[PDB]
Design a protein around this ligand. Structure first.
Ligand code: CA
Length: 579
DNA sequence: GCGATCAGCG
DNA sequence: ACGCTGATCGCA
């Protein structure tokens, strides 16, 4: 029902200087995954190509790699990386329908061309799931069915670029797509393909020492409970704690007794078993997620892990990291942080370099709220978290422990993002009236933040959405809901999203500027990871000193705010040492 | 499959 | 009853 040439060879008219291109990779993880077909729509017609013929044709390969041949695509990073795993470079991507749909409305959850097309009443294309099936039924359909699906996706991309660009323009988002998200997409593709090298000998050695310690703690838990049970099981654990041992019930879930860490540490006065259960879970978490889980995804011949950075997923414009998640490698407790010793540079005599923003969201907040006192604090390069810990725990800078700081940190963000006196009192183990008086005192010192919180909720009610500094957008229909709890969660999204999303915009601009500066300087250094406000690189040890000056400066200058941006940086032999 | 839990980011 | 995530596990 849609006309196309199922081509047997590449022709010159398939190589126009403007085209919609589909390079189809059906596997969710596209690393080293099969490319199952190719479609090209341009002014000359619609074309399907088998990949074993198109990807071995030197004129088609050249066309893919020529940046003056412009391509419109959907999820160009997936295609670019799958092509890198074929040894082929994709350049010239000038429109990405996925990133355009994400910028227009991240809540759509647009995961395929059909979902994006539906935003503009375009429906001459099927959802990927209807073509490929789900789960155990997932299959590449017969070639005629595949070819038409890929042609229809390309035809849709060809027709939808113009209306998506016009809405982006109206939203002040067209430069955000073309100068930020699309260049970032090529950078993420390089980081993912490069991967991170893992010391599997040390990982396996740690896992075996962990397996020993796990058994020891397990037996002492049984001995302390006077019986054995599935410590990982909520029912049995609840029975032991709150029926056999008759500990107080401080919280319930919809399922039954809550056993979360906040509850367990409140039960530490009552029974020593609860601290062994915490230690057990922590060791089990390291074993299952960060030892076994990492060894499961290491590519054995290179010892590399290749994460996927999802760029069109979070509602605030942050990235996320999948399979493995390299954005939540342990750091806070010493036992877990040692896992970062397994993350090593990918060449001999290279080093890991890490740089990160300090208190980025509070600085963003100070800029956006124009709060005089918060701006003055950052002009003094004050460490708000430490000073806040001094106030909470009535101690001096010398006496503020890491645990007191990271808890002061949760209070600092908690307050600006709508924590209640109840919530604060539970977190600080203080009374509820002390928590309420603390909160009003902090708003006395920072009335411009309080103003910003009120103004931004009212702006979300009037406009229907909130925006970030670089014009990222988030619709909040629940903000006018009659339901109190629904409306409350939406109000706290209105307070939080412009701040967190602006901090995401800044690190993204920093990554783009860093790549251009690294090229300008002809350095071999390259990005490996982003962790929200941190960039991890590797480089020859001979570049470390230049990077100590280049990277912080690129990050500090990514944008110009009413307060300065502060970057810390470290390097070393492993990711562990780059702190 | 989902909710609870916990690892990270602020 | 601060916000944004992803992986693992048991299943009340
Ligand atoms: Ca930081």
């Amino acid at each position: 029902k849609m006309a196309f040439t199922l081509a047997d060879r590449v022709t010159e008219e398939m190589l126009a200087d403007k085209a919609a291109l589909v390079v189809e990779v059906v596997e969710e993880n596209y690393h080293d995954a099969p490319i199952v077909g190719i479609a090209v729509v341009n002014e000359h017609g619609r074309f399907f190509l088998r990949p074993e013929t198109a990807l071995a044709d030197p004129q088609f390969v050249a066309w893919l790699g020529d940046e003056t041949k412009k391509k419109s695509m959907f999820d160009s990073k997936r295609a670019a990386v799958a092509l890198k795993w074929k040894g082929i470079e994709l350049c010239g991507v000038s429109f990405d329908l996925l990133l355009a749909a994400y910028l227009l409305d991240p809540a759509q959850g647009v995961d395929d061309v059909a979902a994006a097309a539906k935003m503009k009443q375009y429906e001459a294309v099927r959802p990927d799931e209807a073509v490929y099936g789900k789960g155990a039924k997932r299959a590449v359909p017969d070639e005629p069915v595949l070819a038409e699906h890929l042609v229809r996706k390309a035809a849709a991309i060809w027709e939808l670029e113009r209306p998506f660009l016009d809405e982006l323009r109206r939203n002040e988002q067209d430069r955000l797509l073309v100068e930020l998200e699309q260049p970032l997409s090529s950078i993420l593709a390089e980081m993912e393909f490069a991967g991170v090298k893992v010391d599997t000998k040390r990982l396996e050695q740690m896992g075996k020492e962990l397996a020993e310690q796990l058994g020891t703690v397990e037996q002492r838990i049984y001995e302390l409970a006077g019986q054995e049970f599935n410590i990982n099981s909520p029912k049995q654990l609840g029975v032991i704690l709150f029926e056999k041992l008759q500990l107080p019930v401080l919280k319930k879930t919809k399922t039954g007794y809550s056993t979360s860490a906040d509850v367990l540490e409140k039960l530490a006065p009552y029974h020593e078993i609860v601290e062994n259960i915490l230690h057990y879970r922590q060791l089990g978490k390291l074993q299952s997620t960060y030892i076994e889980g990492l060894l499961k995804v290491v590519r054995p011949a290179t010892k590399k892990v290749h994460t996927i950075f999802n760029q069109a997923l979070t509602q605030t414009g942050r990235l996320s990291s999948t399979e493995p998640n390299l954005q939540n490698i342990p750091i806070r407790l010493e036992e877990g942080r040692k896992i970062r010793q397994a993350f090593v540079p990918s060449e001999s005599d290279w080093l890991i370099f890490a740089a990160d923003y300090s208190q980025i969201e509070l600085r963003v907040l100070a800029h956006i709220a124009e709060d005089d006192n918060l701006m003055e604090a950052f002009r003094r390069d004050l460490d708000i978290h430490t000073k806040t810990a001094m106030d909470i725990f009535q101690v001096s800078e010398d006496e503020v422990t890491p645990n007191m700081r990271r808890q002061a940190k949760a209070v600092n963000y908690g307050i600006v993002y709508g924590i209640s006196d109840y919530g604060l009192a539970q977190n600080l183990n203080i009374s509820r009236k002390e928590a309420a008086e603390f909160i009003e005192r902090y708003f006395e010192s920072f009335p411009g933040v309080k103003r910003y919180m009120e103004n931004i909720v009212q702006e979300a009610k009037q406009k229907g959405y909130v925006t970030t500094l670089l014009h990222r957008r988030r619709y909040l229909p629940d903000i006018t809901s009659r339901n109190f709890n629904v409306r409350s969660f939406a109000e706290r999204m209105a307070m939080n999203t412009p701040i967190q999303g602006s901090a995401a915009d800044i690190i993204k601009k920093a990554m783009i500027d860093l790549n251009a500066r690294l090229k300008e300087e002809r350095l071999q250094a390259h990005l490996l990871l982003q962790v929200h406000d941190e960039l991890i690189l590797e480089a020859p040890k001979e570049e470390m000193e230049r990077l100590c000056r280049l990277v912080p400066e690129v990050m500090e200058q990514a944008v110009t705010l009413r307060v300065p941006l502060k970057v810390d940086y470290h390097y070393g032999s492993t990711w562990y040492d780059a702190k």
